[PDB]
Ligand binder design. Sequence first.
Ligand SMILES: [K+]
Ligand SMILES: [K+]
Ligand SMILES: [K+]
Ligand SMILES: [Mg+2]
Ligand SMILES: [Mg+2]
Ligand SMILES: [Mg+2]
Lengths: 6, 6, 6, 6, 490, 490, 490
Amino acid sequence: AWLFEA
Amino acid sequence: AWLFEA
Amino acid sequence: AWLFEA
Amino acid sequence: AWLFEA
Amino acid sequence: HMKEIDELTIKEYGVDSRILMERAGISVVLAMEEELGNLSDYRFLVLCGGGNNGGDGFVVARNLLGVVKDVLVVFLGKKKTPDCEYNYGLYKKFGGKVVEQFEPSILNEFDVVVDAIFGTGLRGEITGEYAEIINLVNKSGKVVVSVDVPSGIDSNTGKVLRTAVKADLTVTFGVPKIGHILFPGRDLTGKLKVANIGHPVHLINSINRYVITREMVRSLLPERPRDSHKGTYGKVLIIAGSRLYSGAPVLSGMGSLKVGTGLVKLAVPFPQNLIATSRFPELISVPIDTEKGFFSLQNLQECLELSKDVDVVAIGPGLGNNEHVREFVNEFLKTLEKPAVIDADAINVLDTSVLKERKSPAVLTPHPGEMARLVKKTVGDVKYNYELAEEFAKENDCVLVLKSATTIVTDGEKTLFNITGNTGLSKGGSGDVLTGMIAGFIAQGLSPLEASTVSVYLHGFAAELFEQDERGLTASELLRLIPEAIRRLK
Amino acid sequence: HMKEIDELTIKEYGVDSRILMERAGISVVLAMEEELGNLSDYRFLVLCGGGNNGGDGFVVARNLLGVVKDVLVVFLGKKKTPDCEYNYGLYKKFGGKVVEQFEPSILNEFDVVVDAIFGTGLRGEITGEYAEIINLVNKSGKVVVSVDVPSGIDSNTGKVLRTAVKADLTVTFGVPKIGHILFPGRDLTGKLKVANIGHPVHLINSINRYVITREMVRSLLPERPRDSHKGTYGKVLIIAGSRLYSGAPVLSGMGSLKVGTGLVKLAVPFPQNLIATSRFPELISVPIDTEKGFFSLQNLQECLELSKDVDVVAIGPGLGNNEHVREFVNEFLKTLEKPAVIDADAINVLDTSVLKERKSPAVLTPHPGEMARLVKKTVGDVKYNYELAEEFAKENDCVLVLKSATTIVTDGEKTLFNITGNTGLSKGGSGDVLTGMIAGFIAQGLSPLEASTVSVYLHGFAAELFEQDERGLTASELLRLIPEAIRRLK
Amino acid sequence: HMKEIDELTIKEYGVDSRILMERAGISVVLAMEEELGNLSDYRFLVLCGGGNNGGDGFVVARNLLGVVKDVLVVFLGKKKTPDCEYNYGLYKKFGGKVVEQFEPSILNEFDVVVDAIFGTGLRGEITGEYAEIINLVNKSGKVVVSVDVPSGIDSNTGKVLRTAVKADLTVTFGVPKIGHILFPGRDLTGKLKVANIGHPVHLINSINRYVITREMVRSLLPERPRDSHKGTYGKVLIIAGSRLYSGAPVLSGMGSLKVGTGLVKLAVPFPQNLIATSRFPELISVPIDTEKGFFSLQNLQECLELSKDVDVVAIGPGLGNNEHVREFVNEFLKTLEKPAVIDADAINVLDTSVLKERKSPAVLTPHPGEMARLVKKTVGDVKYNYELAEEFAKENDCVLVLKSATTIVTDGEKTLFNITGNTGLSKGGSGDVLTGMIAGFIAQGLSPLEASTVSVYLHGFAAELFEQDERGLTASELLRLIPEAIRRLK
Ligand SMILES: [K+]
Ligand SMILES: [K+]
Ligand SMILES: [K+]
Ligand SMILES: [Mg+2]
Ligand SMILES: [Mg+2]
Ligand SMILES: [Mg+2]
């Protein structure tokens, strides 16, 4: 989760 | 069961 | 292990 | 593999 | 807007705009790897406009150089912004190929199209050669990855500006934009990833419009303390049904029971009240004696007495729409000093002056046809019109739940968007269930807005848990699926 | 060096140094997430020096703000380079906390230490308060992530400059550095990830020293065409053994057979030659009649005749080291016009003048004690001394394989490092197997350097495939494991 | 002894003797439940003497009352100690039945016999009616649980005092007693549980004799640092074999290699030395020229030269026992300034004066027949005689490893008992392997005592890992199993 929210 | 009832 | 060593 | 080699 | 978040991050926080642009483009590469697996066998065609969207595209292209099978940029703009220019320069210094003319057959030699033509800086209808290129890309059958927003979607409304790219994967930055959330844009976005590109967390959180998430709903669910009784979980009165529409009361009542309400009472014209308890004997279904099968002023006093012993009243599903119903509904709501959930035919006859005079709260749950009639506009003018929903909620001191594949929930200050559900909810009865759910959560102690947020989410999510094809979902099956949706939140 | 790669990438390619620094720091965050899982429950202590290593640390710290439980930077330097200063400024603008004094108890309040104190810019022994901090971190039992190289390792040699951080995870940029590859640095590095931070691929590939990889070895393995016969796969003569050392020939011979050689012949003093065929009857073990159980000049002519019908000759394992062996070995190699693999006692007696006069190729396979005696230096001066290995290889026109936990393979122009294997190879017999493997691959058509590269890798990898504790591995078991190592490459 | 530990715990620490007795008896109940599962369907016959062992039995019986199918105590003593009397009184106050005459048919009506007749307070041969009862219990086929020690075992020696109870389960208190550890007592004990009954941990740890445990051996295993070479792991010389006994050298040598030794050299009479390398070519097997196939003084000088370059020397397996071997062995050991591992025929010819004069350490590894001859006593007087082993070790400044199903390892101050292994080790060759293992661990840096402790354990444990029936285990298979024993420790 640090880079992307889905 | 000799020592503890749950 | 508190009570018995095997 | 684009970011990291292991 | 994110345009403001970008500006503050550069101008006040001091992050170089080039750094944001680099992080955006690498986010795209990583998102593509996550979706496609190893990128090294693919050939990439990157379509870059002259704006910052295109600059992000040059970063993508540059970062694929030497690592994938082939990369080509088609630069479609006229001039380049400073960051697009810096990145274009880097792409060439690294040995990248650019062409400025799009040849229709070029699509043949590539596996993935990276659409970095227009982002949130899109102004006006796309025409001319931009349109032909976008139409060619959409007919090509290639994998399409859109940078920020599919080119041609208005990122504030989700409308298609004449033509728009249809993406398999869209990678956006910071937060989802409204155009990913509302249709048609939501459809054209395909799978959406939201990348963190280095904005301060405080700015990302200063956004006033929100997608309703599983984590938000889980944190809003009421507590179920072990030492409780039915009075702990509240009481709902549902005023609903008519000789014409005898099923609506039953669907609303069970909607309140399935979300955990302690007691649910229906007031329904006799003998149609008996329908409810034949199906679900846990309901209380009070017979209301009417002259011709519809509520009228003659039933005002009995309905007010029934409302004294409850926490919330839902009104409208299946009432019918004639003058006597209109008189009853408006006089009732004017006098009722309880929260009201107002749906269906109660909306169709509502005098909005009445909402302004109520001291007690209300939630209104129209579909666009009902909203259109309520404010005297066309369906097309109100559909997905979140600013009009906000003004209405604010002017009438209510929560407005505007139903559609993406549902808008607003009290005028906070606006939430719901994206759960499927087309099995596009069927008579669905709305009647949601009305009951909302009333039920209010009865359990949630605010009108919180109740509405939790209910729209769980209603849509229950629909997705249906085990067979969605088109066969009915309201009765939806009701069955609600407690499973609740368990799956936790 | 990467210092040059960084410079070119900034000065000639035009990538802003801030962009490289941002990509470095985010690489660290992502690597930590891959190792620790979700970062949001951890508290991070980031130790930053005043150099660019520390600047990378400020990027890490800034990118954890608002997303993890706690972040604190202890800034240990005096001045800051321009990029460290820019990043320090960003970290504070984003609301980050810095302190400039390290309190021993501070370690208590954190779960992960990010070591960004010194990188490749380390000059000289670490003393004073830098040393106390590093010693405190090493005693703390916390998870340690080192930025670029663990602070205190010399990145060109792998030596500890008085004291060094022991990391669980090291994230380096572009390419592995020599100090991650050679011990002790290799040990202190822990798990190494190499991040791509945006250098042109052409520069990353202009590096002349390389880690031997599975993909490299797979591409070097000889072809096995179906229509082949034993002559297709070459012939090896192994000149080895003595009355004292009767096992070495057997281990070398089978080393050649297990890598796919068509025919292997041993020349061994009678009756010790019979040992080989009692164990492995597929070997040819020619009896050499000797006066006292050792090769001497009396056997020169027979050994040269035996060598006419082979592609490669290995010499040295178990020959013994006396004057008659020295005379034989040097006269043999001076006259032999075939590639030679020179090991063990053949190295101990070698006259290096002989290597310079040979028209044919050679590979030498010393451990450091043997290399030390060969060039007349101390073990400590030659161990992991890749520049001395390179000079030797270049001056003597040979391939040098300097054995140790990391093995160096060089012809003076290209240097490869091998990192496969374990301590089960630290036992009599291991080296004798490798000598056979190298000879065998040469016989099959690989160049001396290629043969050496493939053999050191597969020898180490076979050791790792041993199914029980590595300390019980013996050469005989290693031999059994070779064809499995080969199958696993493919 | 525990008798002293009990006394201190009562008299100095202030724990009431009744509390210790209560904890002992409940420990027994819980141990029985762990072995039998639910106790409620079983009928218990408790046989109580008049001592504290019997008092523990009354506690057991009292704690089963009302909870199992039936309980009966047969009280067999004359008088009762104060705590047995208090407990007998409690058992009756709680409604328990006691009888004072043992009827042979009484065994019929019970499923479990609790043997609390005699504990560590047993003095002298059991005769008369105590013996008949014990013999009846042993013929009965019932489940037998012994309190503290099976009645009739001497708890200091493990001898049977004329007759003894054969238990399925023995529950002892604080620490195992010597009579559970040495045979025959070890056999009669069956499954042993050691219960904590409340002694201070400091007292329990002041015991000077110890069972060798997995945790102890794991903590003693040498480290295998990654940056190592064969010299890191030491060098062993094994002086062994003869024209009569050509296999022993091979088994010892590989015993050192399988435990992780870097280099192993054998000195063996020619041509018997060639046997070793035909089987395991990783060994160095130096030919020793002898007159008639045995070591003699003529080989003294060569053996001393060979020993200069090693860390440890093992001597004895297969040397033969004649006067010239005796001369050689004693002169060698007198002159050798290295640790010595002395086995087999080197023990049979040893002059023990020589051990006293050695400045360097030694370990001796006799079976009882060899120990008997060494100190000039009968096998029966030395077998399991740990006090004699201790005196010998102390007087001769050595470590003594007295081999048997329970092996005793002592340096005179510390004594350890090994209980791993099985009867597959009762076969020629087993001992030769252990000698090599011990030498090997010494070479790797363990003290003689530590090396002996680790080796006896792993040797026995490897035997237990044999996959087929133990009687078919041979030394060659044992060697194969050693690295698996090592891996399983970790
Ligand atoms: K786009
Ligand atoms: K560092
Ligand atoms: K007993
Ligand atoms: Mg509706
Ligand atoms: Mg060697
Ligand atoms: Mg023996």
